[PDB]
DNA sequence: GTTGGATTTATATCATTTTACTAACTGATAGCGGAACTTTGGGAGTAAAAGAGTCTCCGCGAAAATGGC
DNA sequence: GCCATTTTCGGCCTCTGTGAAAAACTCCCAAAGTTCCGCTATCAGTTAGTAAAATGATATAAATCCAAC
């Protein structure tokens, strides 16, 4: 999780973001932004954070867009 | 749902509001139908139905009739669980005083109307009278009137006065009190009086009175008239087996109270004689006291088992009480436990989990997956397949386990590495397979230890386990920052045997293209593993700026080091391998790999080191034998000579030339030098051998003995154990501490006789008993430290302060104990670090010291640097990130919102089990104290200056002469005053002699303002001052141990911080334990939380009381911004026990210890706990304000700001 | 020994202790300290409430895991309510404010 | 290329089978209420005189917070 | 200020099962409990009946189309 903490900066904020994204994927039904490769939502969310597509700001903006829609 | 927890006195109106009915009779259950009877202790009307959605009479016996009360039985049809929430009450015939409010010293009834507890208890046990309404008589309130004296008073006044007796008298005395005017009486009385005892009593009583007026509680409520009754399932009466019943002692206590109250009512009905009524009231008071707190008022009431009954207090308090047994430590589901074995094939993030435990723990997940893929239609079918152990259940288990971390724990959990998250690999058998490299973190060895297994369930828990608790992320010790995954035992032996040099081995002098060629040569039985060769090594250096420079040269090495170079990652020198590798060398390999490569390369390298070490320790064939213990031939000659010289001193004692003590201390030295010489001879014989080189000469080689290799590799063993193996066991201590004159001259190889074995047992038993008591004491110390430091969380990034602590290398003579680089590694600077003799700003402000800046600060040779500290932090709650610095377990700056106090307490308390003028450097000399500085700016030597070869500035060359650890650590942390404190100078001034009055001596100090302060001095004190001399503040008056209190009072915060820091670090360093100073600084900051106000100023604080320092900072800042005058204080030092019981929150204080007085004070004062700490949030079950739960609480605070 | 869900104690409403009783492992004070040191607020909350004594919480969590949600709605521990009742029985008004 | 009978589609009416909704008999079974009888549960009473408690235990130490002077 | 008596603490896991003293009868009356029997409500089980709907079968009318003259 070194890449994830490098991209985020704080371990606790990284845990919060990853947990929120994993809950969205498991319950809401959002599709994975990265290839699954037979991985659980936790590892998928961590990989998405490491790549740089999922952050707190991105999640907040996406939620705002959904609420507007 | 809720934000705080208020505590206060329960008025009779409130008690009646809580209750759903009145309990009238002591009957519990019927003996035939086993049904509750009416108005009893288990009544179904008051407390609720026994069966779910039914009633006692059975008329309304289904859910359709919810909320409907039967007319026949009166039982509301609802769930049985309401019986654990419904309360009752008993209307006592006569008032009964609360036992806590009377014997929790100081008594809050005695100190609210100014009357001693002996007098009050004389009134309560119905022995004297007290006047309530004097009226127009000579008597006043509170006067004792003896029974005969009361008859005379009734004779000459009669109806004019009321002089009551018992708890009723207390109640109406407290009724007659007017708190406002009586507090004003305090206020006007304090200024007039001068005595300190009267003033202290007066302010204590004023504080209590003002608390009563502010809280809204009335003193009337101090005495009970209505007694609440607990829900029945909290005091159950249940059938164990075959008609036998199990009850709670609360039932017996309540039965006594009800029976005696009923008897009192009956006696009052019949107009009984006064003596019988009085005795009944006395027993009612005794029974209520035994119900509330048994064993306090008098002798403890015992049951039919001749054991004392357990009351309400005894079960809200203690180690076996509610707090510590059920609210702080809970038995949990989804848990398992098994014996641990070793898995040498595992990786760091993997642990071996048996399939039976995985099946039982992950059962709901298996059910979920079976339903979602449709193999099982419903939950019953899924349970059937799981129980039948079908084939597809195993594939489902291997899909659930795939990416689900599991928490492994070992008891005791001394530090945070005792619980770690692993990825499970499912195995046959019943034992958990553990990676060897984590055993040192668990203090776990495979002789029968068991570990607990916990399965996190929610997504947040899984992310926390994978991101924070993974064994891969936990490779550095939070106590010191050193790696904790360093190899031990077999790995070190294998890497040591592989990296050894043998003279004239097969294949010596060959030239090899690289590591692969060397591996090929050894696998082909061409070159021995210890053959000297020349190998072409390609090597990459990763500089500090990131430069990757590759190079290739021919290095003289061995085959083994060439092979080991295969697993070394790129970016490291070959000089790290081109040597024999003991434990320290491998630790340095891992340390530098982490420093220059990161974490992933480090964990892969650690795994590969482990596999290579295991493989080559296996291939080495190291075996211990009986010919490996080479007993030197000089041992017998040395024993004979020692015996001859002991006989010579034995025939010299009769000459009178020596005393008995001199003979003892000379025979001891004779044998304690024979031991050293035998040990040295054995080591010389065992560590060397003579071999034949290629030329044919005889050459000395380091030995390849099994025991020598075990000791030198550092795997397991040391010099002392070898000396007891093949040399001499040595002198031993008698059970009193004395040393037996005749030592044990035999080793374990040749065996001991009976007496020697007896003497050895004398010390073995002491060792075992001291290990056990040490474990107990260390546990208690760690608990106290955690309970004082549990509230320290990093709450900010920068507190914006300019204060700091200076640091220099530690000097205890002419040698350095620990350098400035070690001290300042990871601490943010406070002021700019100027170049020595220059105005260049070498290191700017607010920078974190990594190894790069450590190399800089070592190269430029600067001695003293100012860095931020936790003690000097200005944060209102907790500390800031910069004042703490680097997180040792992470390697970077501390994150916002992690419990640094708990880490500090665990780091300090973990090693408790292990706790038991010649000149040599060229340079100049100076007077400060005396200092000796080398050519550079480093001060090499420091010595004290007593009351003289060279003067100041004189250059000196080498050789030019000028002329119970754990109890100590606990003593320092509780700030215990020494037996003979060293007197210090309170004020700066001139010493002058007084008059040696009878008993002890007096002195006086003359201040610069002409004041003469009188100083009490014991006669035996060896005064170190002369009259006519101006002494400074804090100067030593009499030599001796220094209490921390007067250092704080007369020197300052930094002085006491340094004193505690080094006097705990000396205990730790003497034993070989490395603990960073930030932890002790955090504990000290928690120990300096309190201050006494001296100047009222414009603040509301009354001088003479203790208040928290943060409250005073807030008030002073507000008053300064308003412009009004601030408040002046004195900062006080409290022990780690008093500070914990003086916390603002009463729930944490009650959960620590001393529950009765904490709850009594909280209830009387009417406190409010805002739930702003770790322990209170643990008790109430919500998120802790640390770690992942930090931000959440912040938002709530934001929601409380708006 | 292994356990997911079994029998519970009468008063504390907490899992039993021992293999013979099919009990659960004890998460004592030092385990709580270790999780506080790590920063695992959510793991600590789960082990305190759902796994031990939150009566509605554990049933809801079992139902959610069977459904496949892996989310919890934590509630008040039962031992704290026992403590509140016991303190109230001593004539001391302890209460929760909103 | 043709044209008219017939050989199929087109539309409607009739008969058969089933559905929707009644009642009557059959047979039982549970529930409630009353009368009688036996069992249980509470209360009063006892008339040589008899006229001061247990209670075994009691193998703990260091430190601190409390009265009392 | 200083004794001098109370009060308060003393590590984590795991198994574990407790019965073990103690001395009255007697008479009278009221209420609960036990049991039996009768009335009443409530439902399964079965049969037969009547009107109506549904569905299929047949009838009646054309389209057109194809073969023979
Ligand atoms: Mg062991
Ligand atoms: Zn009812
Ligand atoms: Zn700070």
From Swiss-Prot, chain A:
A GO term for molecular function: DNA binding
Instruction: Name the chemical reaction catalysed here.
Output: RNA(n) + a ribonucleoside 5'-triphosphate = RNA(n+1) + diphosphate
- Keyword terms: DNA-directed RNA polymerase, Nucleotidyltransferase, Transcription, Transferase
Gene that specifies this protein: rpoZ
One cellular-component annotation, GO: DNA-directed RNA polymerase complex
Instruction: Tell which residues of the whole protein are contained here.
Output: 6 to 74 of 90
Q: Which organism is it from?
A: Vibrio cholerae serotype O1 (strain ATCC 39541 / Classical Ogawa 395 / O395)
Listed under GO biological process in this entry are:
DNA-templated transcription
User: What protein am I looking at?
Assistant: DNA-directed RNA polymerase subunit omega
Query: What does it do?
Result: Promotes RNA polymerase assembly. Latches the N- and C-terminal regions of the beta' subunit thereby facilitating its interaction with the beta and alpha subunits.
Give the enzyme's EC designation: 2.7.7.6
Binding partners and assembly: The RNAP catalytic core consists of 2 alpha, 1 beta, 1 beta' and 1 omega subunit. When a sigma factor is associated with the core the holoenzyme is formed, which can initiate transcription.
Which family does the entry's similarity section mention? Belongs to the RNA polymerase subunit omega family.
- Disulfide bridge map: none
Give the enzyme class: transferase
Q: Flavoprotein as a keyword?
A: no
Q: State the superkingdom.
A: Bacteria
Q: Is-annotated flag, keyword Nucleotidyltransferase?
A: yes
Swiss-Prot record, chain B:
According to the record, cofactor stoichiometry and binding are noted as:
Binds 1 Mg(2+) ion per subunit. Binds 2 Zn(2+) ions per subunit.
User: A GO molecular-function term, please?
Assistant: magnesium ion binding
Q: Where does Zn(2+) 1 bind?
A: 55, 57, 70, 73
CDD domains linked: RNAP_beta'_C, RNAP_beta'_N
Residues reported to bind Zn(2+) 2: 799, 873, 880, 883
Q: Does the keyword Nucleotidyltransferase apply?
A: yes
Question: Which amino acids does the record list as binding Mg(2+)?
Answer: 445, 447, 449
This protein's GO cellular component annotations are: DNA-directed RNA polymerase complex
One family name in Pfam for this protein:
RNA_pol_Rpb1_4
* Enzyme Commission code(s) on record: 2.7.7.6
Class of this enzyme: transferase
Catalysed reactions listed for this entry: RNA(n) + a ribonucleoside 5'-triphosphate = RNA(n+1) + diphosphate
Record's keyword annotation contains Metal-binding? yes
Q: Name one GO biological process term.
A: DNA-templated transcription
Q: Which cofactor does it need?
A: Mg(2+); Zn(2+)
Q: How does it assemble?
A: The RNAP catalytic core consists of 2 alpha, 1 beta, 1 beta' and 1 omega subunit. When a sigma factor is associated with the core the holoenzyme is formed, which can initiate transcription.
User: HAMAP family per the record?
Assistant: RNApol_bact_RpoC
Purpose of the protein: DNA-dependent RNA polymerase catalyzes the transcription of DNA into RNA using the four ribonucleoside triphosphates as substrates.
Protein name in UniProt? DNA-directed RNA polymerase subunit beta'
From Swiss-Prot, chain C:
Q: What does this protein do?
A: DNA-dependent RNA polymerase catalyzes the transcription of DNA into RNA using the four ribonucleoside triphosphates as substrates.
* Subunit: The RNAP catalytic core consists of 2 alpha, 1 beta, 1 beta' and 1 omega subunit. When a sigma factor is associated with the core the holoenzyme is formed, which can initiate transcription.
Q: What family does the Swiss-Prot or TrEMBL record give for this protein?
A: Belongs to the RNA polymerase beta chain family.
> What's the protein called, per UniProt?
DNA-directed RNA polymerase subunit beta
Supply the source organism for this entry: Vibrio cholerae serotype O1 (strain ATCC 39541 / Classical Ogawa 395 / O395)
Q: Which gene encodes it?
A: rpoB
Complete protein: which residues are present?
A: 1243 to 1340 of 1341
């Amino acid at each position: 999780v070194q890449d994830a903490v490098e991209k985020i900066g704080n371990r606790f904020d990284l845990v919060l973001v990853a947990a929120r994204r994993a809950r969205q994927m498991q319950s809401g039904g959002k599709d994975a932004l990265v290839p699954e490769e037979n991985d659980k939502p936790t590892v998928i969310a961590l990989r998405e954070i490491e790549e740089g597509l999922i952050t707190k700001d991105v999640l907040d903006a996406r939620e705002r867009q959904e609420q507007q829609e | 749902e809720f934000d705080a927890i208020k505590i206060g006195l329960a008025s009779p109106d409130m008690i009646r509001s809580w209750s759903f009915g009145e309990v009238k009779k002591p009957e519990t259950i019927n003996y035939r139908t086993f049904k509750p009877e009416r108005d009893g202790l288990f009544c179904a009307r008051i407390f609720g139905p026994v069966k779910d959605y039914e009633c006692l009479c059975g008329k309304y016996k289904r859910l359709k009739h919810r909320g409907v009360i039967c007319e026949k039985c009166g039982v509301e049809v609802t769930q049985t669980k309401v019986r654990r929430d419904r309360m009752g009450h008993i209307e006592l015939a006569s008032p009964v005083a609360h036992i806590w409010f009377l014997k929790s010293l100081p008594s809050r009834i005695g100190l609210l109307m100014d009357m001693p507890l002996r007098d009050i208890e004389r009134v309560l046990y119905f022995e004297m009278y007290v006047v309530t309404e004097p009226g127009m008589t000579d008597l006043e309130r509170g006067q004792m009137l003896t029974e005969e004296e009361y008859l005379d008073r009734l004779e000459e006044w009669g109806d004019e006065f009321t002089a009551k007796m018992g708890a009723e008298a207390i109640k109406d005395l407290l009724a007659s009190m007017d708190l406002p005017a009586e507090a004003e009486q305090m206020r006007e009385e304090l200024d007039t009086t001068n005595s300190e005892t009267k003033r202290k009593k007066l302010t204590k009583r004023l504080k209590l009175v003002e608390a009563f007026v502010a809280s809204g509680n009335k003193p009337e409520w101090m005495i009970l008239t209505v007694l609440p009754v607990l829900p029945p399932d909290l005091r159950p009466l249940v059938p164990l087996d075959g008609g036998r019943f199990a009850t709670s002692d609360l039932n017996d206590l309540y039965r006594r109270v009800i029976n005696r109250n009923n008897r009192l009512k009956r006696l009052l009905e019949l107009a009984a004689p006064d003596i019988i009524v009085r005795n009944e009231k006395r027993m009612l008071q005794e029974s209520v006291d035994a119900l509330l707190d048994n064993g306090r008022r008098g002798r403890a009431i015992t049951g039919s088992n001749k054991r004392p009954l357990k009351s309400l207090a005894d079960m809200i308090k203690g180690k076996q009480g509610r707090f510590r047994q059920n609210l702080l430590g809970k038995r949990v589901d989804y848990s398992g436990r098994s014996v641990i074995t070793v898995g040498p094939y595992l990786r760091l993030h993997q642990c071996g989990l048996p399939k039976k435990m995985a099946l039982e723990l992950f059962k709901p997940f298996i059910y979920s997956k079976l339903e979602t893929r449709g193999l099982a239609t419903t939950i019953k079918a899924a349970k059937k397949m799981v129980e039948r152990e079908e084939a597809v259940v195993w594939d489902i288990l291997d899909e659930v386990i795939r990416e689900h971390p599991v928490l492994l724990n070992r008891a005791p959990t001394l530090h945070r590495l005792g619980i770690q998250a692993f990825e499970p690999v499912l195995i046959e058998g019943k034992a958990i397979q553990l990676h060897p490299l984590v055993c040192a973190a668990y203090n776990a060895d495979f002789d029968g230890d068991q570990m607990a297994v916990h399965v996190p369930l929610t997504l947040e828990a899984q992310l926390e386990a994978r991101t924070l608790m993974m064994s891969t992320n936990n490779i550095l010790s939070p106590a010191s920052g050193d790696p904790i995954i360093v190899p031990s035992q077999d790995v070190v032996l294998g890497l040591y045997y592989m990296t050894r040099e043998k003279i004239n081995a097969k294949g010596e002098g060959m030239y090899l293209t690289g590591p692969a060629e060397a591996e090929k040569a050894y696998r082909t039985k061409t070159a021995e593993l210890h053959a000297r060769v020349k190998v072409r090594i390609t090597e990459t250096i990763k500089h500090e700026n990131g430069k990757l420079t590759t190079e290739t040269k021919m290095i003289d090495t061995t085959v083994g080091r060439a092979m080991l170079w295969q697993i070394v990652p790129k970016g490291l020198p070959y000089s790290l391998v081109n040597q024999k590798l003991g434990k320290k060398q491998i630790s340095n390999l891992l340390n530098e790999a982490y420093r220059k490569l990161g974490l992933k390369d480090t964990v892969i390298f650690a795994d590969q080191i482990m596999y290579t070490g295991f493989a080559y320790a296996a291939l080495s064939g190291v075996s211990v034998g009986i010919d490996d213990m080479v007993v030197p031939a000089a041992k017998y000659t040395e024993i004979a000579e020692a015996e001859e010289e002991v006989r010579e001193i034995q025939e010299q004692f009769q000459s009178g030339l020596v005393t008995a003590g001199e003979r003892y201390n000379k025979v001891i030295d004779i044998w304690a030098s024979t031991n050293d010489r035998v040990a040295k001879a054995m080591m010389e014989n065992l560590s060397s051998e003579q071999v034949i080189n290629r030329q044919g000469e005889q050459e000395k080689q380091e030995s390849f003995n099994s025991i020598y290799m075990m000791a030198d590799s550092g795997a397991r063993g040391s010099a002392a154990q070898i000396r007891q193996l093949a040399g001499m066991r040595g002198l031993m201590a008698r059970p009193d501490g004395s040393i037996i004159e005749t030592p044990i001259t035999a080793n374990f190889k040749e065996g001991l006789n009976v007496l020697q074995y007896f003497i050895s047992t004398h010390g073995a038993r002491k060792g075992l008993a001291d290990t056990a008591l040490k474990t107990a004491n260390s546990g208690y110390l760690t608990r106290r430290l955690v309970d004082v430091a549990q509230d320290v969380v990093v709450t900010e990034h920068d507190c914006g302060t300019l204060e700091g602590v200076v640091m220099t290398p530690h000097i205890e003579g002419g040698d350095v104990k620990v350098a400035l680089t070690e001290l300042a590694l990871g601490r943010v600077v406070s002021e700019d670090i100027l170049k020595p003799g220059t105005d260049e700003v070498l290191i700017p402000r607010n920078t974190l010291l990594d190894e790069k800046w450590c190399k800089v600060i070592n190269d430029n040779s600067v001695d003293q640097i100012k860095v931020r500290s936790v003690v000097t932090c200005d944060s209102d709650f907790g500390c800031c990130a910069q004042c703490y610095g680097r997180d040792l377990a992470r390697g970077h700056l501390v994150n916002q919102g992690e419990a640094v106090g708990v880490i500090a307490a665990q780091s300090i308390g973990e090693p408790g089990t292990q706790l038991t003028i010649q000149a040599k450097n060229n340079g100049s000399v100076k007077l400060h104290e005396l200092t000796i500085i080398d050519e550079f700016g480093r001060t090499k030597e420091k010595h004290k200056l007593p009351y003289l070869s060279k003067a100041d500035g004189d250059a000196v060359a080498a050789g030019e002469t000028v002329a119970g650890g754990l109890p100590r650590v606990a003593d320092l942390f509780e700030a215990r005053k020494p037996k003979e404190p060293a007197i210090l100078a309170e004020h700066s001034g001139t010493v002058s002699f007084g008059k040696e009055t009878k008993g002890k001596r007096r002195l006086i100090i003359t201040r610069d303002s002409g004041d003469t302060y009188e100083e009490m001095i014991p006669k035996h004190r060896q005064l170190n001052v002369f009259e006519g001399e101006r002494i400074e503040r804090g100067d030593v008056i009499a030599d001796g141990p220094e209490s921390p209190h007067d250092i704080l009072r007369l020197r300052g915060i930094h002085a006491v911080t340094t004193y505690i820091a080094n006097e705990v670090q000396e205990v730790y360093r003497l034993q070989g334990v490395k603990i960073n100073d930030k932890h002790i600084e955090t504990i000290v900051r928690q120990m300096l939380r309190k201050c006494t106000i001296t100047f009222a100023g414009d603040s509301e604080f009354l001088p003479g009381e203790t208040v928290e320092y943060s409250q005073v900072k807030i008030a002073n800042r507000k008053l300064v911004e308003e412009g009004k005058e601030p408040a002046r204080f004195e900062r006080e030092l409290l022990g780690i026990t008093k500070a914990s019981l003086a916390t603002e929150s009463f729930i944490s204080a009650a959960s620590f210890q001393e529950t009765t007085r904490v709850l009594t004070e909280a209830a009387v004062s009417g406190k409010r706990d805002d739930l702003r700490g770790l322990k209170e949030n643990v008790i109430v079950g919500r998120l802790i304000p640390a770690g992942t739960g930090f931000a959440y609480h912040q938002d709530r605070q934001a929601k409380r700001a708006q | 020994h292994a356990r997911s869900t079994g029998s519970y104690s009468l008063v504390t409403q907490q899992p039993l202790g021992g293999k013979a009783q099919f009990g659960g492992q004890r998460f004592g004070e030092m385990e709580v300290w270790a999780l506080e040191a790590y920063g695992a607020a959510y793991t600590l909350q789960e082990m305190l409430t759902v796994k031990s004594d939150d009566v509605n919480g554990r049933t809801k969590m079992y139902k959610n895991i069977v459904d496949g949600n892996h989310a919890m709605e934590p509630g008040m521990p039962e031992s704290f309510n026992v403590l509140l009742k016991e303190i109230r029985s001593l004539g001391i008004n302890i209460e929760l404010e909103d």
